[PDB]
Amino acid sequence: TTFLIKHKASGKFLHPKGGSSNPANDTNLVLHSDIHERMYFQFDVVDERWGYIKHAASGKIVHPLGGKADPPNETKLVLHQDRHDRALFAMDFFNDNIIHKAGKYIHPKGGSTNPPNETLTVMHGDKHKAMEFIFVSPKDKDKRVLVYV
Amino acid sequence: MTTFLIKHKASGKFLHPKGGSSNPANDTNLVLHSDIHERMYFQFDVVDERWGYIKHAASGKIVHPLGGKADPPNETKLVLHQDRHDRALFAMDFFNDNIIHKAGKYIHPKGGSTNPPNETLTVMHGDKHKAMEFIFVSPKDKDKRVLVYV
Amino acid sequence: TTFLIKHKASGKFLHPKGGSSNPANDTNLVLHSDIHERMYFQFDVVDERWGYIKHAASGKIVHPLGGKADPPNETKLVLHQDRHDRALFAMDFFNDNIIHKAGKYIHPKGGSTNPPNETLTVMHGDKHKAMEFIFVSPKDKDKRVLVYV
Amino acid sequence: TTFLIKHKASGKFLHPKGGSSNPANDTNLVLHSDIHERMYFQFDVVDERWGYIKHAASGKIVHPLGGKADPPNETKLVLHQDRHDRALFAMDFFNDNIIHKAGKYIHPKGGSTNPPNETLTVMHGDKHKAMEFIFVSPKDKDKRVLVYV
Numbered sequence: 131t132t133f134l135i136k137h138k139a140s141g142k143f144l145h146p147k148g149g150s151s152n153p154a155n156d157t158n159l160v161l162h163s164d165i166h167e168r169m170y171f172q173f174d175v176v177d178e179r180w181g182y183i184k185h186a187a188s189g190k191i192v193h194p195l196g197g198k199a200d201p202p203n204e205t206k207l208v209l210h211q212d213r214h215d216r217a218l219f220a221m222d223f224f225n226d227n228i229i230h231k232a233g234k235y236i237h238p239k240g241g242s243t244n245p246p247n248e249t250l251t252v253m254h255g256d257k258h259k260a261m262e263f264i265f266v267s268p269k270d271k272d273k274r275v276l277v278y279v
Numbered sequence: 280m281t282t283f284l285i286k287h288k289a290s291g292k293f294l295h296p297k298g299g300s301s302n303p304a305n306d307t308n309l310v311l312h313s314d315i316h317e318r319m320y321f322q323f324d325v326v327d328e329r330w331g332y333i334k335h336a337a338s339g340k341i342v343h344p345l346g347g348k349a350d351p352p353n354e355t356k357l358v359l360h361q362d363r364h365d366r367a368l369f370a371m372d373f374f375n376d377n378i379i380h381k382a383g384k385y386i387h388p389k390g391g392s393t394n395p396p397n398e399t400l401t402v403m404h405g406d407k408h409k410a411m412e413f414i415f416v417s418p419k420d421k422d423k424r425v426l427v428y429v
Numbered sequence: 430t431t432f433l434i435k436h437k438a439s440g441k442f443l444h445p446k447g448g449s450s451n452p453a454n455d456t457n458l459v460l461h462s463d464i465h466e467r468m469y470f471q472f473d474v475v476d477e478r479w480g481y482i483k484h485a486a487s488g489k490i491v492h493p494l495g496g497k498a499d500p501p502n503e504t505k506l507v508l509h510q511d512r513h514d515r516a517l518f519a520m521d522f523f524n525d526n527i528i529h530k531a532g533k534y535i536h537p538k539g540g541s542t543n544p545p546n547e548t549l550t551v552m553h554g555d556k557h558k559a560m561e562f563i564f565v566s567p568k569d570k571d572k573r574v575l576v577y578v
Numbered sequence: 579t580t581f582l583i584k585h586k587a588s589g590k591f592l593h594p595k596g597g598s599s600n601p602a603n604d605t606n607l608v609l610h611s612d613i614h615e616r617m618y619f620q621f622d623v624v625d626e627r628w629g630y631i632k633h634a635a636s637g638k639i640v641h642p643l644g645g646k647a648d649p650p651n652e653t654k655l656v657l658h659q660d661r662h663d664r665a666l667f668a669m670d671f672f673n674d675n676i677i678h679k680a681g682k683y684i685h686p687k688g689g690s691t692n693p694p695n696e697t698l699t700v701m702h703g704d705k706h707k708a709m710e711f712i713f714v715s716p717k718d719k720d721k722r723v724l725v726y727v
């Protein structure tokens with residue numbers, strides 16, 4: 131059920147800022163190269179492709195900060211306990227991205243294919259190699275795993 | 280695994296075994312037909328992340344390019360066959376709305392029409408366009424997309 | 430200045446139906462494998478990429494039948510003497526297609542990559558291998574030529 | 579025949595570094611917001627879509643530094659007097675980019691959609707909004723002009 135969200139170009143992973151097992155609400159999601167249980171994710175299916183990206187350790191899920199239905203470019207991604215249909219994402223493992231219900235994608239802030247550790251993540255409509263993500267085994271960061279099962 | 284219909288997106292016709300038998304013979308052609316019934320239900324058996332077997336639910340037989348070659352050429356017919364091996368691996372791309380073979384070609388209606396008539400055969404072809412799009416829907420509601428990977 | 434409009438997948442060319450030096454107004458544009466002076470074309474630049482696709486022998490130009498600004502899918506292509514901005518096209522020699530001012534493309538009617546002789550042409554929004562065209566020398570149908578100079 | 583090479587996302591233009599009427603061989607090509615006669619370009623057609631990107635004031639043309647047929651990502655763009663088929667580019671005014679004979683594109687170094695003045699340019703194969711260019715009138719930087727005539 132658990133997987134790592136790996137920035138495709140850099141090999142860094144999605145983390146709660148601070149890497150806590152229980153991040154506070156509205157904790158920013160960053161990219162970091164470390165692997166540990168506090169950066170594992172799960173995907174709770176809600177409606178076919180749509181569901182919640184769940185931080186495994188805490189159970190909080192990925193939100194655009196503020197929870198708007200149509201967040202603008204550069205809206206920061208955070209973890210928050212609330213469940214609602216503005217926190218709906220799809221894990222596009224064919225095109226290798228993470229898309230929000232309103233159509234923008236998870237990006238590293240600043241759009242780099244080699245973002246340093248602690249780089250924030252934001253929503254943005256653009257499509258390029260720096261917004262690509264693959265979903266891999268916690269025991270083997272190079273083995274893709276099916277997030278939907 | 281979830282049961283679903285394979286619906287040609289532009290026309291609304293569905294993937295069927297030729298003749299619509301509950302136990303198609305090996306190498307029975309896969310065709311498009313407008314009817315819905317239990318003998319055109321499919322399932323998807325995951326083998327390796329995105330890759331798996333497109334399984335005819337009534338018979339247990341799975342989708343093959345005729346002849347089972349690793350890299351089948353354009354116009355290779357799709358058929359049902361009991362054998363399981365890695366040349367019968369497909370992925371159900373429900374984001375781009377197609378069915379892609381392990382070697383990179385897609386399931387097409389033979390002739391590539393967006394309105395193929397009943398009994399039109401299906402073939403492998405590398406082209407991507409409107410006429411090779413498929414969506415995966417509920418046997419109870421042909422307009423409701425369902426998740427085939429669980 | 431003169432070039433052939435070659436259906437990229439089949440090698441057939443754009444012709445006035447009947448192959449006449451002076452096609453009547455609203456004569457259909459068809460695909461035919463023959464080469465001769467009555468299927469030569471020119472391009473009259475009007476505004477950067479936009480211009481008139483001119484039948485060389487007659488001076489008539491390519492119109493969507495009826496001259497509408499936003500012709501629907503399957504609108505037939507014809508030759509007509511009139512000049513106006515609803516007959517504006519662009520010769521996209523990078524993506525290999527012919528695009529109308531309102532954004533649809535010249536297609537073989539029926540969308541075949543191997544259309545028979547006398548197949549009509551129509552406007553259609555779809556993009557695929559059967560709507561591709563390249564622009565070649567009247568003396569060598571495999572030598573691309575610049576239509577904008 | 580003369581035009582400005584405008585970075586589409588930022589509005590900055592291609593310049594010879596230092597802005598000289600006679601840049602020395604292997605002078606870097608940079609982006610800068612100024613307009614003046616020493617950043618005007620022309621395009622000398624050689625083979626259909628392929629030609630030389632000519633600095634109007636000096637007559638030198640755009641090269642990948644070193645003039646190799648298949649330059650790698652991050653090869654700097656410069657001006658050089660020599661004319662040969664490794665300095666062949668095409669001005670894709672449909673997809674809005676500048677492509678080299680071997681298939682890579684002119685990029686701002688660093689791939690920003692808002693590169694600051696003096697940012698160098700390099701070859702890179704990636705396609706995204708930061709490598710888009712449009713070609714405009716020296717008298718009106720928003721009016722696209724046909725570079726091929």
Ligand SMILES: OC[C@H]1O[C@@H](O[C@@H]2[C@@H](CO)O[C@](O)(CO)[C@H]2O)[C@H](O)[C@@H](O)[C@H]1O
Nearest residue numbers: 145146147148149150160162164166248
């Ligand atoms: O931001 C994610 C990263 O957080 C690190 O944890 C921080 C340590 C450094 O280890 O110092 C603190 O700031 C205060 O205790 C931690 O929050 C993790 O070590 C990284 O693995 C990573 O998760």
Ligand SMILES: OC[C@H]1O[C@@H](O[C@@H]2[C@@H](CO)O[C@](O)(CO)[C@H]2O)[C@H](O)[C@@H](O)[C@H]1O
Nearest residue numbers: 156193194195196197198208210212214
């Ligand atoms: O950050 C994700 C969370 O955003 C909340 O929205 C904020 C509310 C608190 O409700 O106060 C604001 O800061 C100003 O209106 C909101 O942006 C949502 O209520 C949460 O459900 C969650 O999406």
Ligand SMILES: OC[C@H]1O[C@@H](O[C@@H]2[C@@H](CO)O[C@](O)(CO)[C@H]2O)[C@H](O)[C@@H](O)[C@H]1O
Nearest residue numbers: 178179229230231232233234374376424
């Ligand atoms: O293949 C079409 C698919 O469109 C999805 O919805 C799109 C959203 C994502 O929520 O972004 C857009 O592109 C712009 O609003 C939507 O069209 C559907 O959820 C899928 O079921 C599917 O129809």
Ligand SMILES: OC[C@H]1O[C@@H](O[C@@H]2[C@@H](CO)O[C@](O)(CO)[C@H]2O)[C@H](O)[C@@H](O)[C@H]1O
Nearest residue numbers: 237238239240241254256689690691692
């Ligand atoms: O934050 C995500 C976005 O980052 C952009 O990259 C910034 C460029 C704009 O190209 O200018 C900077 O601010 C400094 O170079 C970049 O950090 C991307 O262009 C967007 O596509 C998007 O990823």
Ligand SMILES: OC[C@H]1O[C@@H](O[C@@H]2[C@@H](CO)O[C@](O)(CO)[C@H]2O)[C@H](O)[C@@H](O)[C@H]1O
Nearest residue numbers: 295296297298299300310312314316398
């Ligand atoms: O090819 C798929 C279709 O097969 C039909 O079954 C054929 C009937 C028509 O009912 O006549 C035969 O050719 C001889 O019995 C059948 O094989 C199904 O009725 C359709 O639902 C469809 O499955």
Ligand SMILES: OC[C@H]1O[C@@H](O[C@@H]2[C@@H](CO)O[C@](O)(CO)[C@H]2O)[C@H](O)[C@@H](O)[C@H]1O
Nearest residue numbers: 306343344345346347348358360362364
């Ligand atoms: O059509 C799918 C099946 O094709 C078989 O391959 C055929 C063999 C039988 O082995 O006889 C031929 O017709 C001539 O070599 C093959 O095309 C596969 O063995 C099956 O596993 C299956 O893929």
Ligand SMILES: OC[C@H]1O[C@@H](O[C@@H]2[C@@H](CO)O[C@](O)(CO)[C@H]2O)[C@H](O)[C@@H](O)[C@H]1O
Nearest residue numbers: 224226274328329330380381382383384
């Ligand atoms: O896009 C990356 C993915 O590529 C898949 O392999 C592709 C095969 C499908 O097996 O079709 C090609 O396009 C033709 O070569 C392959 O690139 C992988 O199975 C995926 O894991 C993934 O890496």
Ligand SMILES: OC[C@H]1O[C@@H](O[C@@H]2[C@@H](CO)O[C@](O)(CO)[C@H]2O)[C@H](O)[C@@H](O)[C@H]1O
Nearest residue numbers: 387388389390391402404406541542543
């Ligand atoms: O069989 C699938 C393929 O069908 C092609 O369509 C045929 C065209 C060629 O375009 O000529 C015909 O034979 C008669 O018009 C078509 O049936 C598609 O071009 C291919 O993309 C593919 O779908």
Ligand SMILES: OC[C@H]1O[C@@H](O[C@@H]2[C@@H](CO)O[C@](O)(CO)[C@H]2O)[C@H](O)[C@@H](O)[C@H]1O
Nearest residue numbers: 444445446447448449459461463465547
């Ligand atoms: O439709 C374009 C084609 O028209 C042919 O001309 C017709 C001849 C056949 O030669 O018989 C007519 O229908 C009556 O005279 C002609 O209009 C051309 O020969 C072809 O080259 C082609 O242009």
Ligand SMILES: OC[C@H]1O[C@@H](O[C@@H]2[C@@H](CO)O[C@](O)(CO)[C@H]2O)[C@H](O)[C@@H](O)[C@H]1O
Nearest residue numbers: 455492493494495496497507509511513
């Ligand atoms: O077919 C191209 C031509 O279409 C004409 O439009 C037709 C008018 C004539 O004005 O009468 C109709 O048949 C019915 O309204 C029109 O479709 C244009 O006037 C021509 O300029 C030309 O575009």
Ligand SMILES: OC[C@H]1O[C@@H](O[C@@H]2[C@@H](CO)O[C@](O)(CO)[C@H]2O)[C@H](O)[C@@H](O)[C@H]1O
Nearest residue numbers: 477478479529530531532533672674722
């Ligand atoms: O890529 C931008 C270009 O768009 C052209 O306008 C497009 C028309 C053609 O007029 O077809 C559309 O796609 C329909 O919406 C237009 O966006 C401009 O003529 C070009 O100058 C250029 O801006």
Ligand SMILES: OC[C@H]1O[C@@H](O[C@@H]2[C@@H](CO)O[C@](O)(CO)[C@H]2O)[C@H](O)[C@@H](O)[C@H]1O
Nearest residue numbers: 392393394536537538539540551553555
């Ligand atoms: O007329 C141009 C259009 O032709 C379509 O092709 C027709 C298909 C629909 O797919 O059904 C037929 O009528 C018979 O097979 C085809 O002639 C294309 O799909 C369109 O893209 C367009 O080219």
Ligand SMILES: OC[C@H]1O[C@@H](O[C@@H]2[C@@H](CO)O[C@](O)(CO)[C@H]2O)[C@H](O)[C@@H](O)[C@H]1O
Nearest residue numbers: 593594595596597598608610612614696
């Ligand atoms: O690099 C392109 C820019 O060059 C500037 O010229 C430099 C001036 C600043 O005016 O100071 C120097 O570094 C030393 O003389 C110049 O090389 C141009 O003024 C800009 O218009 C621009 O071309």
Ligand SMILES: OC[C@H]1O[C@@H](O[C@@H]2[C@@H](CO)O[C@](O)(CO)[C@H]2O)[C@H](O)[C@@H](O)[C@H]1O
Nearest residue numbers: 604641642643644645646656658660662
């Ligand atoms: O920078 C563009 C120029 O590159 C030259 O190639 C360099 C020669 C100088 O002739 O010496 C080197 O530095 C060592 O091999 C070359 O990289 C070309 O000769 C010029 O034609 C021009 O392309």
Ligand SMILES: OC[C@H]1O[C@@H](O[C@@H]2[C@@H](CO)O[C@](O)(CO)[C@H]2O)[C@H](O)[C@@H](O)[C@H]1O
Nearest residue numbers: 523525573627628677678679680681682
């Ligand atoms: O439509 C295909 C075109 O290919 C061009 O050449 C391509 C070059 C750019 O020169 O980069 C590639 O993509 C890989 O090297 C080439 O295929 C031709 O110049 C065009 O005439 C045209 O054939």
Ligand SMILES: OC[C@H]1O[C@@H](O[C@@H]2[C@@H](CO)O[C@](O)(CO)[C@H]2O)[C@H](O)[C@@H](O)[C@H]1O
Nearest residue numbers: 241242243244685686687688689702704
């Ligand atoms: O030099 C042109 C290339 O710039 C890349 O951007 C660099 C990113 C990686 O995206 O890491 C940096 O070095 C610092 O953030 C960027 O300058 C682009 O990704 C390439 O597409 C290309 O444009």
